[PDB]
Design a protein around this ligand. Structure first.
Ligand SMILES: [K+]
Ligand SMILES: [K+]
Ligand SMILES: [K+]
Ligand SMILES: [K+]
Ligand SMILES: [K+]
Ligand SMILES: [K+]
Ligand SMILES: [K+]
Ligand SMILES: [K+]
Ligand SMILES: [K+]
Ligand SMILES: [K+]
Ligand SMILES: [K+]
Ligand SMILES: [K+]
Lengths: 297, 297, 297, 297
């Protein structure tokens, strides 16, 4: 299979179920809204060793927000409900309630399940909290240094997907990295999705467990490490490839992960030096969500 | 005291003791280094509910790096040795070892005490790791998708200070925010320091524990909340002040904290609308380090 | 008349006729496309002393571009046809054909009037040009150091409007500025419009000639200068106002100018400290296009 | 010759004499100072068809400016005195005097040759002009909408150099581009120099006249165009190079150009895929300034 003149292996990505809450952060302008979102979603690449998986989803124009100001929608992910509930409180309470000019609202107003993050954080007012309605949302005003911080009572969450992905293989590292940046920019416009790794790009890659150091939970996936292909049997790196990068995608549903994957691949293949596009899986075992690349075009 | 025509209260900031590790991250250019530093230092405003207090210290020119590539020094802070070693492994292992083009070196080559974070993280190579020396530093090469990740064997840490600060009072919110942003920019050029909060700015402010909710580790500092000055008897908000913002500073030592405080105030007072400058403190024997504002100007 | 609680004067803006060309610039990703668009539209705030009035209109998603890669649409304006053709060849030839990874396409495909800028610039190939069709567009490939620069044969231009506007009055300079920045951000999502001044904001403001220096083509509009209200008898500055900022808007048609004016004001009035909103005119004796604030809300 | 393992041809760069004025622009913070500098330095890549060659030189810290505010130093270049005098009036009067919060000062106080830019632009005040002294500099306050614009009345200039350069050849377009990017970032820290092309990088390149279209004053240097190497018959592009990027350097003196050239090359050779490093000249006849690469290392 070829896409934009680039070879795309007819294989699949294997994803997993995960809980995801969608939050809307607004501010004076996009800069301040972003300052808060970025801080609240850092240290959030993988649940392997990060408190959660998080990222900025998409910008929100004044015409679409409750208070009529510019903002950003962000996603915070965790394997368990209580875990996600815990992440929302810590991240929004330590990184957004404390950020300049911010106000937070529910990013999934029609969600089945929701947690009372607003009700809990408002206790920060130590008794001076007030109740207010902003564009129809029921909120709380928390008096503090800059003025009144406004936060909706609840935040909705849903059963999403984590681990959507695709690999980019190229002739040099720069070519692979530029293809990966293109993919991330392209994916940034896709609603309902995020790319949690640094800059949204994975430079490491991984395999469950290890072959030598059994005391590890995950190690380098030597079969996709170009610098040691001569030393690895059954290596998946072609003779002309010197570098590989992966794009990991978390999303509210399968259709969104699928669109993100197509959009990302389409853009990546525009960069000279790209040799091959494929994706990572676990042989059909472990995963519950499978994305077949040949079904994307 | 008067600085640039503005009223500065002759009081003090009450800082606390904290462990600080200094890490140098390099990459192709400033953008890629920043991407790694940014991800690794997020969700790190306060130890009250964040896994640590982190932030970008200063830009590192190629002329000053072991590999001759552009980079950034970052600081990761924690109250104890185990937690810091812990945060170093998690943030660097999940946010820097995974980010494109990066290499990590000891940001405090000197310093007696250090953690062997490099030695532990190299196990990720599962036996394919190799020793290599870069710019006179003992590092490890970890094969992965992008190529080889280079990391020094050890990272140094020292007894630093967290909690240096000053408050900015203005006639309107935008005026207080503009001065706060001006302070953050000026402080960015100061070596050995970081401003942990979002955008480096504190919009909330906190006090003892709580009046009504003793189940809170901290609550709003109502005495500095202009929106409720009326129903507050010991309010520290002068009549015409409608907004306040705080700047928290963490750093390697007192001289650095004092420099950052001085530089931030000088810049803050250039903004129209600023009426008063002060600092926050508590019980004498509660915070070890005191920073008297009257000794900085 | 009040908007969001802020008073809006029931007056009008007086704009003028101008020629406008719309160009699409694409690259590896948004950064590189922005690099070219930013350089090409610089030194272009006003026709009084700049070679032209220009600016970045809006983002162009990969799904909307002829080549499927990210980009930005920009507008370049001039009073005459000859002057506009000249500015297209100079700005695109010197600032886009020379920038990394770009390609340029016709941003107004259905316009009847066009300039053959592509045809002229391709001579730079000195005999090595080659014709190529991209996404249905007739183009030329120009080999140079980086590879081949792709540029459509021509660019469409239309009769647009310059000078759409509104003034923002506030209690402090930071308040008026934050409001203006809020409006610029909101207006950045509006199609068919550009905000030509630095950061899209007018900090000066001007009037036809000059009372004391008749050799000037324009001078400060004293009736709107806060700092000297006590020395100007016809001052239009209310008592509590210390700073004013203007937002100038150029665009393809009246409906666009109108939408931008409306969205800008809505955003601006969300900033604390804003006291009044109005607009600039010249008695209706100069501009053909009048924008009544009354009809926007 | 080898630098960081990369082959560096033992040739030279051939530069020319040009008039350069240095201007300091300050604002509330680095963001606002940048907005004005950016706008004022755009549409300025080459005097061939641009009004001038301009760019941002280096950041200016509060401790270094006359008003104690953050800012940026920019360079505006022109071949003649009067052309330079005019470019200062237009760019600064149209792009800085109009940008939010700015103040301008002389960037070369010790230069005997100076232009009275400030004295002429203050006529904008139409009589309400007022003299003020800031940090020892003699300036003018010009009343306007945002308040009072402060500008020193004189701006110095000197006989500088235009055309410093070196070429980066790589196996892929992304490889050469990342190399040139790194070089620009590395040069941004060098005092007294600027990189005038888009993002500071030249993707085109050129030769004096033309081989086929003689009415042209310049055209593609086909001997350095990778895409037509099989054709040229005089190509200077080695078999394995697919793309080339050039970095043009302008500066106050020779020492500075050399430092910038050295700094750029060193950083560029750090990027994987770079094959060769050389520079552009004209047989040593056209330009007066020669920079031999072999004497920089
Ligand atoms: K807040
Ligand atoms: K997205
Ligand atoms: K993240
Ligand atoms: K890495
Ligand atoms: K710092
Ligand atoms: K932080
Ligand atoms: K180009
Ligand atoms: K727009
Ligand atoms: K412009
Ligand atoms: K100004
Ligand atoms: K420089
Ligand atoms: K330039």
């Amino acid at each position: 299979m070829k896409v934009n003149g680039v070879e795309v292996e007819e294989t699949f990505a294997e994803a997993f179920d995960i809980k995801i809450a969608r939050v809307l952060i607004t501010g004076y302008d996009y800069y301040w809204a972003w300052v808060a979102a970025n801080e609240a979603t850092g240290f959030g690449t993988s649940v392997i060793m990060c408190p959660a998986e998080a990222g900025i989803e998409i910008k929100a124009k004044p015409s679409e927000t409750p208070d009529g100001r510019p903002g950003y929608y962000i996603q915070i992910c965790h394997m368990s409900k209580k875990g996600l509930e815990e992440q929302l409180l810590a991240r929004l309470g330590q990184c957004v309630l404390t950020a300049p000019t911010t106000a937070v609202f529910n990013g999934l107003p029609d969600a089945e399940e929701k947690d009372d993050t607003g009700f809990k954080l408002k206790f920060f007012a130590d008794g001076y909290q007030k109740e207010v309605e902003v564009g129809g949302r029921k909120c709380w005003a928390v008096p503090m240094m800059e003025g009144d911080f406004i936060i909706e009572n609840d935040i909705g969450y849903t059963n999403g997907i984590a681990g959507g992905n695709f690999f980019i293989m190229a002739e040099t590292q720069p070519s692979a990295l530029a293809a990966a940046k293109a993919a991330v920019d392209a994916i940034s416009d896709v609603e309902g999705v995020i790319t949690p790794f640094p800059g949204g790009i994975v430079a490491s890659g991984s395999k469950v467990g290890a072959n030598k150091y059994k005391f590890l939970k995950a190690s380098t996936n030597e079969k996709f490490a170009p610098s040691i292909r001569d030393q690895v049997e059954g290596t998946q790196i072609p003779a002309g490839v010197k570098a590989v990068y992966e794009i990991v995608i978390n999303g509210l549903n399968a259709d969104a992960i699928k669109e993100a994957t197509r959009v990302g691949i389409l853009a990546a293949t525009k960069i000279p030096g790209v040799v091959k596009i494929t994706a990572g899986n676990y042989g059909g075992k472990l995963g519950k969500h499978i994305i077949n690349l040949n079904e994307l075009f």
